Symmetry: D2
Subunit: 465 residues, 4 copies
């Protein structure tokens, strides 16, 4: 059972909007909104969305496997060895948020301070003492972006596995000689850094010049979660505020996906007339180029929605019914909707480019969709005895590592998104710091009343306690 199986199972349920049913439903962890900082929903005047992995949640592992297969085929196309074709995507290996070290070719799981929690070279998981040869302080400088790449998005899951497949393949292929920083093949040297850049380039190519989007839209039931409660929630948001879309994707793709997401024989509720997806939005903006969007952005363009091409020129007019924008900046949204940052609840899947910049640069309120939480919550509640024992051992050595390994393996080979044993990951720290609210799906807002006050306990410093 993948996290998207859980989401689709919940998506198939119709919405019982009786008040008591809702309050009972929201008490379950799976349908709850989690609160890092208090948020008064009645102060929210605008709801903003990205599309990918927020409105359009791609099914797992089918979508990762398609991305992986096309990326592999691209690498072979540009001259990587034929043996790459025998790879097959394995969802049990990657956890999101790992760091690829382009110097030594390792995947690292780190805490918020760059301390190493897990280190794997290919499929070989390196134990602590052996990690000290390459990481003398068991520490990396995350901000050294020339050396380290953080595989932060769900789109990075296939390449997370592919990097490990490639390091494993070249390590064990007798044509190559393993070196500290790459692989020797006579008079050719492939550094881990150049191999990584080839992988990154191929993933970009598959998304923007290859066939990934085409294959997705030709079988949307296979690749995209669909929930009849989505138009219901959006319709309820539009009753109390304004609703906008700000997506990095282009209009043609956005139109295909959003049309599928709204393709029911009804509108917001069963029995109601169907409405086009655009009618749910006060403002639609594509080609957003986030995170630059939250700074100076790009020039504001208008989409010709008949042709899918941009009209000629910078758009200087006002907000008009039916207009679709391209580029611009977050100030475009605020100006046209008459919003201030703290009036906006912005809902995204990208802990950096959506959530981090919108919070740090503009003071928007933030809702982070974490799709994998739909399954991680089940592992967390079912194996609570493991974690409880771990807490007891901490309060009370080899037992601690054994329980830590057993707990971590329930989530996969790279453990929970949020921790390794008792130590929290970088990703966990960033969620807590930048996501005011978070949940496995933004649909969980449907189960809270219009003016709900989401509450978090006040933080005190140690000397204040």
């Amino acid at each position: 059972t993948s996290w998207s199986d859980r989401l689709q199972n919940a998506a198939d349920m119709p919405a019982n909007m009786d008040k008591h049913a809702l309050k009972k439903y929201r008490r379950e962890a799976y349908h709850r909104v989690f609160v890092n900082r208090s948020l008064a929903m009645e102060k929210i005047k605008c709801f903003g969305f990205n599309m990918d992995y927020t409105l359009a949640v791609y099914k797992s592992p089918e979508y990762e496997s398609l991305g992986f297969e096309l990326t592999v085929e691209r690498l072979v196309s540009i001259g990587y060895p034929q043996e790459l074709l025998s790879f097959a995507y394995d969802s049990t290996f990657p956890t999101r948020g790992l760091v690829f070290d382009t110097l030594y070719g390792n995947l690292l799981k780190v805490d918020a301070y760059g301390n190493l929690l897990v280190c794997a070279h290919g499929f070989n998981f390196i134990r602590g003492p052996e990690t000290r040869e390459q990481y003398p302080n068991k520490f990396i400088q995350r901000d050294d972006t020339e050396r380290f790449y953080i595989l932060n998005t769900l789109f990075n899951l296939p390449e997370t596995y592919l990097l490990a497949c490639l390091v494993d393949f070249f390590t064990n292929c007798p044509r190559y000689t393993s070196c500290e920083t790459g692989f020797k093949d006579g008079d050719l040297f492939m550094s881990y850094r150049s191999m990584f850049q080839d992988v990154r380039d191929a993933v970009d190519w598959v998304h923007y010049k290859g066939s990934l989007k085409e294959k997705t839209v030709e079988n949307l039931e296979k690749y995209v979660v669909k929930d009849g409660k989505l138009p219901l929630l959006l319709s309820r948001m539009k009753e109390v505020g304004k609703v906008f879309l700000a997506t990095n994707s282009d209009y043609k793709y956005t139109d295909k996906i959003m049309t599928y997401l709204f393709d029911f024989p009804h509108g917001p509720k069963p029995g109601s007339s169907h409405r086009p997806w655009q009618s749910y939005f006060d403002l639609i903006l594509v080609d957003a180029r986030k995170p630059l969007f939250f700074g100076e952005g790009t020039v504001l363009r208008q989409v010709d929605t008949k042709t899918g091409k941009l009209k000629i020129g910078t758009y200087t007019g006002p907000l008009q019914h039916g207009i679709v924008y391209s580029g611009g900046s977050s100030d475009t949204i605020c100006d046209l909707l008459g919003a201030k940052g703290k009036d906006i609840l912005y809902i995204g899947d990208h802990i950096f480019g959506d959530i981090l910049q919108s919070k740090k640069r503009q003071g928007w309120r933030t809702f982070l969709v974490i799709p994998e939480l739909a399954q991680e919550l089940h592992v967390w509640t079912d194996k609570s005895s493991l974690f409880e024992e771990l807490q007891s051992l901490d309060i009370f050595q080899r037992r601690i590592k054994k329980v830590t390994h057993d707990m971590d393996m329930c989530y996969g080979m790279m453990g929970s998104l949020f921790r390794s044993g008792s130590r929290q990951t970088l990703f966990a720290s960033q969620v807590m710091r930048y996501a005011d609210l978070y949940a496995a799906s933004f649909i969980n807002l449907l189960y809270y009343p219009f003016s709900y006050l989401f509450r978090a306990a006040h933080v005190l410093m140690p000397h204040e306690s």
Copy 2:
């Protein structure tokens, strides 16, 4: 009673090293070490120090007032009006960590997310609704370093007050016309930005080309806290590890200050022979140029300690008894002392240039000295009823603001370093995030045994609770 009065009062007490006396002493908040992240003291192999406001704690308000007076005299010297000479330093106005907005000439107290807690134009404290004209989202982008300057150090306290004095003076002087971004005087326009840069330049000048250091060292009893327990603690650190000094100050000043700090008729304990201050350090490094020090640093030089000048050339030799270094980088310390970052407890007063970079760039463990905590703890414990009522009101509007104001004014006109009412400051958030340990004085380590385990409770995410 200033915070340095509290520190000097504690400094005058002799050290009772009976174990039971120590455990009783450390339980009082004033002599305690506070813990943000657990730290096993037995894993610490090196203790590192900055000098200013750590080893050499300058007395308050005498030192701020000297800095203020000399800065004012410098501004008048370069042509500011004579009326500046009637200013006098007022310690009740500034709190550390305020942000000067060079566009609108305001001092701002902000939370960790850039939300406005306090806004003062000169000495006029602007209430919420009126702040929205200049801050529509009641929010600033802290990283806009061209516009905002964070007055983060204790050396910034005089200029924090001076900026408010200047805005007040020009606002109410009939020769000038107040504009949104500065002051008009016929055909001259002084922007708040240019006024701020003049102030910054004058503070730098007083420290590095004026008479501040000379006046300090000619009356060290007036200006510098002195504690006979300092050589005792340093001697105990050297028993279990190595000890280093890494200061931005030059050697001549460092020698004068450190000689005063160790000028007792005894060594570590009463009855023991006096030892020179340099003998307490395995490595002494001046002109450190932090924060650049924690990156590539500068070339390593050797100080001629006879003349106080740098020897000619880059120093290429090994660690030698009696050598004094200049410049270099944090890798110099690690290499020469044979330390890894997590072996080092680095003790500083600078939440950014000491603590933040040493943690983020090198993985050092950190101890933050917060001198004002010596007095803030007394206000916190004496007015706990105010804060407790505030918590109750929050859980249960105009009453909340009234109690918030009354609580804040106990600390001064700009409130507590750590909060305004129930809302934590940026500074508080940075302390929690980057200081593993913190205290009003590093001397509080004297009251914990050699292998003490400082403990902090594990953090859980909302969905993990």
Copy 3:
């Protein structure tokens, strides 16, 4: 008669290698090498070439017209108005080296000091007094690369004409309103700057993602000059030195073009066995990425000449017979051929990226191919009476402008590549400064003996005369 008609006419002639025939042939201006700085051919140990417009001279106006047509079709494809399709390339309008001013939408012909010689807005040629409204000093700052783009290459000829066509079209189309910096269409504003960037992007697209290369190689007799004397000259160069190719083009295109250039039923001389084009080169390097090539360059790769793809890895081996390189830097050439810069005569068409950087960064000797000189020499010699009269008028006002216009129009609407009347262009100054030798074709070297000393008179300063 175009300049490529002249070159092809000379190309069709067989090489008479009798010494007296050669010395007689080289005395004609059309077959001469022109000398800016003295160059002893016997000191030249390596001959280097770019390919495009040097070895492969594209026929005019057929090739410009193809580039123009495909660029126009690309612009219409992305949404420019259908009327663009009625444009047709006109070789009489553009002269190479004009500057597009993206602020005001003008094409400028300038001298070496940025002084304006010609200013055209669309097809309207602006006279001096009217140019002062937009250019008060009749001067531009060439180095303001954000505002000015110098259309320096022969590949820029179609877009030089296209920019003028577009400014003319939008100016006279009643749907648009002409503004100082662009065109208004209701709520859309197309600045000249954004229009220019669309044009630049479309030209790049046609060359690298569109059909330009495909259409070229499917009719090479239509598009590429072919000269049986080319293998003869290259074979003679290889007798006395080494020969290399360093091209920005990729291997597949290079192979197609070079195979055509050598496709004769003979080798160097008639009667000799045909040899593959690669056998004429000691070193072949593609994807050169000049001008970066003459600095740090890029990593050295090896081409798999069977597949046309790059082999995997950085190439670390030595120079080998049959190997083809990709990327690298100019130091690669010098190292592998054992050459110093002044040993190399580098032959190119690009006054900046070939010639300027190779001279300024590496001290190479330079030969500039100027294809248009093949026709400009005929205009210069046939209308020498116009220029002679102009010189006399200068030595001796409205007559001077009238003769200047009449002389300039013999070359086209934008005048000679090298001057407007008595004033030299920027391009002329750059040729004199950076091209040691220059000619309409590098084939003219065939008519000089192996050890010829090309001589230029010494320069004296005014006070030295």
Copy 4:
């Protein structure tokens, strides 16, 4: 006889303003203006000046020797060895425009293309074959400003000699070991680069924080050329146009120097009332910060001429009689004087920061003062037989080098400013390219009528001849 002896000798002569006397006087090379590009004086509407080495020509070698002595004393003060005090300035060694190579510690004389003409390590002049070990192509990349420093100004003459003294001293001092890139002294390594930066820092310090200006103004007759014809020329310029001063120096120094330059018992002519120096200028601007001045510059300030300090604020008013400006940009001059660039003849001594940027960035007309030409012209005319023989040998090997050495030594150990033998220097090329007019003194303009047309012959390309 130094060049300033020649200038002072000419300065002592009174001005005979009879027309025939002037035309006879200007025909002598020493009182002539030399012309690189034609310039119609009647089109000049503004005359602009820098002060140092233009209006205020410092006497040689007295001023260089003072600069040298104070720089040496500063280096010893910061810890260089006492033996530096035995150095004494030697005017026969340095020629202006040499390049210090901070990698290998050499002074280089180069041509316009970076080719090596002379190479000296300390006082050892390295012959061609031995230069190839460090300069394999006998070539340097001038634009590598991290490695090469061009000693372009007359203020650089003392440090040109000092660098050679230092390399010589450390090379031959037995305490140090000579290495390729510097000097070893046990555990200290002084690279040539760090030694150079110490020298540069000390020269800056002497000018801006040391006693150079004080010693200059306390004996201006010793250090500054004085010419009663200066107010006559400036008065004649003001009759036909506007006159401005734009100096990098501060007001207090400018006032002292300019007061001395005008201290005669008469005004423009003998018998006329004396006028203050400021009355000769329509605009006076100090602290110009050229070359940045010719770009965005700095904020415009007003000088309080009573106190010599800047008034508070940016100056926003108009041009007023008696006002003195500070900072600003070249656009300040053009705006306030109502000038376009080609209306301005700007007169300076700095081939880069005055002349180059004013020409390249603004299109000003330029007059370059070359003080050493006052003596170089005498060497050139007296040894014309050497150069004539050299030309004949070139047209017609070991003889050529022998005559080249003999000719070069007449100018000093580093030869003529303008050439080594038949090869022109970089400086010569820059003069020809950026100085429209040039002369040993700008006073030579006095001998040409108000509307004189300075003529240079038109340049033709090789194919145009």
